[PDB]
Amino acid sequence: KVFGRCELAAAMKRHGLDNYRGYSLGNWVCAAKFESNFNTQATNRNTDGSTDYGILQINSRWWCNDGRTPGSRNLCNIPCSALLSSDITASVNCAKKIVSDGNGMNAWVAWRNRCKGTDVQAWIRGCRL
Template structure:
């Protein structure tokens, strides 16, 4: 039925997920940032949020992570539910929009800390010390 196609197209338009190459273009300036490749960033974003800019998840410790990089409200952003050091000086809800500029700025701050990308458990588990070349394949970056 024709309405199924319309519903599908509306869903695509409302989707908050970025494509891998679309994200690669946005993150291009991070290639080599603090020793991490563009592929590291793509792999991390995939395993953290499946490239979903509106991702929000509650963690085992009761904290909440927000956005494409799953930035945690315990340290990095502030929300109405819990006190935070808010090291990124950003509202957690701002990390849920399709404009990921503030997410990138905050993620760069996180990477500057001693843990680096190990701050993201999913990156450490799925991406660290692996051949990640497939993440940028065909993306023209």
């Protein structure tokens, strides 16, 4: 599934991400836009043996089990397959755990490169939330 921008914003809001751990909702929409282009099945393989999964490109070394990554900790206790679902529930549940590390949203490459420090409220412009 490829989410619409405000479609995704609404779902993220329903799941409590607005201002979670100090990140207003637009940070999360921006992260999804630039990590995955809002695609729930986005998957990117890294040379390090890990894979980034789903709309938020969550990495398989520390957060989900794909059965093939070195240093696996599976701290969200889920198959990485769950992070490829068309609904965002597993990805948001896991994201709340990831952002609770001292890293915060720096865990997301694309957030660090295209969202941090910007006008992230623009990503929820015209969403009526």
